[PDB]
Design a protein around this ligand. Structure first.
Ligand SMILES: [Fe+3]
Ligand SMILES: [Fe+3]
Ligand SMILES: [Fe+3]
Ligand SMILES: [Fe+3]
Ligand SMILES: [Fe+3]
Ligand SMILES: [Fe+3]
Ligand SMILES: [Fe+3]
Ligand SMILES: [Fe+3]
Ligand SMILES: [Fe+3]
Ligand SMILES: [Fe+3]
Ligand SMILES: [Fe+3]
Ligand SMILES: [Fe+3]
Lengths: 150, 151, 150, 156, 151, 151, 151, 151, 151, 150, 151, 151
């Protein structure tokens, strides 16, 4: 189904763009958060962007395997991404975490659409790749929710 | 380091972060789109480079933070500050890709050298050491790229 | 489909309970088996309960991610578990292995039902989590069968 | 009791204590998972991980004590039914709990275990059961450190 | 299909073991007889491949065992079941060897995908996951080989 | 210098590769089909064996290459050169499987010893050392198998 | 400073070294001469034992040195001080060998316990701890051997 | 200044050793007496700090030895040379403890910077590098403490 | 319980922390100022010692905290509580330095033994174990120093 | 050659006995040497007995492989060994090292005879085993000679 | 030729040390001056080679010491004993550099084989084993170089 | 700017490579021929030194390459450029050998310092850092040697 592969590639292209944007956004929080929990969150944010760049690369490479070329420039990412960049510096810890949780959730719904497409079209490999990412997102979203709960 | 010198240094650091950020993604571009018999080796070399680049990206940004400034943290800002052009084409020859990273490494090298001079003259020993360390790894990579591209 | 999520959570709740019960049951065999193969089986049983407590923890956390709370007391486990506790001490090696094989098989059919639910409802993450567990169970069941075969 | 042989009254008394320790440790093991899963608050990640360290440590003591019991010629309690019957530790019935509330409770359970373990170490020491003495004392040492740290983090 | 599905899947698995077995030795052939300036790198790449192939070889065979079947375990059976031709020539060019492994990887890929589909439609989640994992590493290798062979 | 000695040695080496190749798969057969209370231990022992066998398989084949010959690299060739019978049955007792590998190890031992004598008498020190190393591990395994099978 | 207690403790320690020394070689005897289907596992278990025994051998001897005494350091002295009989037979059943080491472990356990009590009552905390640690590993081994020998 | 510059540098180094020594114990004080919900994390952070402090303590003292001087090596001397006040109170809040170490780190930073300037101007490259490396870790810690204390 | 005993034990612990603290720096003194052909080895041995000393320093101070007391945390307090004299001279012979640490280790050993007796008689099992562990490492070091200093 | 094998086994039996005796002799020095170089020699001696016990075990096992049974008791070792036990305690470092060097040299000549036998009879495996040991002995003998040289 | 053989062997060993020493530096020459697309891989291969060469360098020199001789230890002596010509040119092609090391490896191989024969015939088992081990690694490298240079 | 400064620096670097090369072999000389009770320790120390020396050898040579020059790569060139005399005698005292390496280390230190100054004044930050790092390790070794040789 040539229409399925194309639909999936379009989704993948967007994921790369969103991941790329998130990668830098996470550095923003990584650098500008402040508060008593600084060190822990500073490190958590790094774990996140390391994980994000990992998904960034595996998805981009899956795109390559599917015969497409991956978006590879900030210009393209800003044009494809559905994630807003963080413009402010100096941010509270709870505010930064709430924002990454929101972006993680946005990515989660976006990735789920792709997993459904891949599943229905028999693209087992893409299915597995997205599902693995979905699993780590789910764990992070849950933990963030738990730390932000009042 | 006096106030002024610090401001000049921060301005340089801000640009370095932007250039490193742009280079980081540019390297992925080559990482993904090069082709040729040497693919695997260069594919891996490119990764070593962007890992190294993102490392410098992070330490310089944090030095900027220590100096009391805030680091540029968005692609919009990077595109506005960077002196490095993004790679618009996909599917590229290995020698073409390497020649381009060599060129960008050289551009970064001259840029970083200006900062090391500023830091050195103003007594900013820490910034001096940080840039010099990066300068060292750049020099090594530039030399190796030159050797592999030499005809 | 919140309907499916509730069904899945109910299954997960039961899995946690069964795993919890198995965890202690495996210690029972771990401590009370006897026979020339003691050391090897003693160690195998430990590998099993370490593996079981791992599944115990990942399934419970998946339940948490799905918005539910995990059963967290022996009282609840005894009330939800479909696995009978080992009441006797001092047990033969073949008898102990035969029993864990049986419990592993029971868990396997139970987990399979959940994987089917998750698969049909698009819960890719839960699907992957259960399937991973199903894989290790399958391997263990096969090995136990091979060692018990006469 | 004599050099390498605690008297019947001593080994029996020690085994009874050990049986209870296994039961309490077993109950604590699951209780710690409860907090591990249901705490919430800004310190979540750190406490979530601390709780895991605790139950890993608890299950370690759980197993070494059970094995000591086996060595002493007894059989170890090995079912939740028996644990609930022997344990002096109440199970956590509520879900969703405050971090300070959860930590205060584990500190309380750790202290309860500490006093119970101390009785056993005294029994073992007086009866010459050097091995059991060393085993409980090692556990007592890690409990003491954890109790102190919890106290320090909960201090206002 | 139930006992009909497991039987179909086992038949596919039996073939996979056979093909993997044949590929395992075929890869050694290239491993030993390739020649050219890129020798060392390819020599090593080929080893990575047969290590990976023998890994899939064993996990699939064991899955077959779990499904209640016995695994083909002799070269005679493999030669009888395999759809992969053995390499009869020695002394082979690097691009020629890589092109051939890429072709066999692609053949395995289409074969494995059929099994993936069977397992998926019959609810054999475990077999599904096992083949999909293998399919993922094959896809990566096929892509890399394609990139290094691209002119 | 006696080309005759190197030719005789190569002929022996080619046979070793073939026998090792056949044993490699035969060991998997036992690995997969043994049954009995000692299953896990023997299952793992068999794997240690085929890992060891494939190691010897590779070093001997490469020695053959160094001597200027090409290594047999196909199951067809192995079946034609091997003096080791493939295991046709599945589902086998542990003592029966171990007795068979002990027998094959002993067969390999006498075969390898002939080669070590040839290499020793012709001054092929390297081949001598290679075979002797393998002979050492075989001796250890044969002894252990004998001890576990002793009644 | 109770010389009387220290002297009694040293006498015990001297004997422990002798017994451990004799056990060390006795364990090799079983290690080498046991036979049976469980060979490999017991062969390795026995090694774990003598490695552990030689460890106790060395720490106790050094404790003796710390207490101002000299350690018995010859087989002649060990044979003269040891309460453990040497194994004169070779070729032994696995259950027979394990039953014998269990017996020797139990003998050592009661002997060590006496020392533990001496050290405890005289305030020799260090010796107490050293023997108790050994007593703990002996207890675990004795229990395991009992479990494997239980019918 | 040759002999004059070396003497000035040694005088600075002697003070650094004294201050580091005092800080080392001061950090233990906080390490032991802080209290609050963040206890474990800060308890560990403080340890990282004193481990790092004692590291600088030792390298600077050894540099002093290399320069031909003897290092101050007693608490009496440290209390006499140190510009850092000892913590007399026990039981302290986390923010209060961190604020104090930040303050001491900043004091050390300005003090170390003077030495780096001296070393740089007199050509003492080695001392320069040593102090600058320490300055780098101090800068990072000062920044992080500032970030965690920011309201 | 018996608070009287706890107070006595805490008083001992407080002194141990003080002595350990003083020893820690004293060991650095020897570490830096010894000279002689055996320099490197002793230099390193001394470091092992102060690393070990600071470890005991920390565990004992924390035990004190657990017992409800606050630990002495300043050089001023240590100098006031310590029974160990600081080393005032620099440039010292290796045998002279080792003889002095042996002497301090022995002083600590007798001091620690009193505490272990107190803890033992009062049922403070944890403190008993902690001190005994330290007593064990001291005993080994004292014995080794004695052996290297023996003429 | 059933006669060469017998001669080799007789040599191996002696090696085991000598190694066994040396093992304990080295502990003697390990425990009783004294002098400024104590720690270093104390450690060197341990390296030696670890190495000796290694050769002890591999040679004994080779003996087993050759169809013989290994001497396994101090009584037999004292009866077969050509190495005298150290009867004195409290010994000088140079004195102890000189003695181990002498025992190493004695072992070296003894092992060489076996390597010659094995070589001439085609016992490649035994040849390699003894030669490997001969190599480590040669290195140790040379180093001891260098440290004892005046 | 008991002692005549040792002298002949020592003479050979002395030459090997000299040749290895010269090769060591020659390999650095290629390591630094090769150029071409395969640069990084060959650059690293060359390093593996000189690390391996310096390893043989040291074990052979030490064997010489064990045999009662003194090892040549100066470039002057090496240049006087070595049969390997130093590389005088800078900037060299990759195939040209590899062809040269292959040639030097082959030269060393024939040289080493003569020593192996000497040692074997004179019963110098240790030297035999040492040279044979080196001969084995040389054989593999020579074969690989041959394969990468083959056209 | 200043192609004169780079030329002067390269000339210095070329000499450093030559001296390091010569020292590398000289250290092996002592490594092999020293004798005395401290043999093992010094034997090992010397190895640490030549490993460290060959490390500096390699990094400086590479820096030279980066600066656009070619590195001296032959013993003939090294003997022509080196200011370090080769050790002609074998069999040497330990104190005599250490005194000589200390002397050569000091010679290298003053030579390296001149380069450090040149690089510093000409803004060659990278070379500055490279030499300074080496200068640091030399300083520590010189100090330790001085301490072990002090009477
Ligand atoms: Fe990638
Ligand atoms: Fe960062
Ligand atoms: Fe968890
Ligand atoms: Fe256990
Ligand atoms: Fe397997
Ligand atoms: Fe290979
Ligand atoms: Fe020892
Ligand atoms: Fe130091
Ligand atoms: Fe601490
Ligand atoms: Fe063994
Ligand atoms: Fe050496
Ligand atoms: Fe290099």
């Amino acid at each position: 189904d040539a229409r399925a592969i194309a639909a999936i590639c379009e989704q993948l292209r967007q994921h790369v763009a969103d991941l790329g944007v998130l990668y830098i956004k996470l550095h923003n929080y990584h650098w500008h958060i402040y508060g008593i929990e600084f060190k822990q969150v500073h490190e958590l944010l790094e774990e996140y962007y390391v994980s994000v760049t990992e998904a960034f690369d595996t998805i981009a490479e899956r795109l390559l395997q599917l015969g497409a070329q991956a978006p590879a420039s900030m210009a393209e990412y800003l044009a494809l991404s559905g994630i807003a960049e963080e413009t402010e510096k100096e941010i509270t810890i709870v505010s930064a975490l709430a924002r990454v949780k929101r972006d993680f959730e946005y990515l989660s719904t976006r990735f789920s659409q792709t997993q459904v497409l891949a599943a229905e079209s028999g693209d087992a490999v893409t299915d597995g790749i997205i599902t693995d990412i979905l699993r780590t997102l789910g764990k992070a979203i849950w933990m963030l929710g738990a730390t932000l709960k009042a």
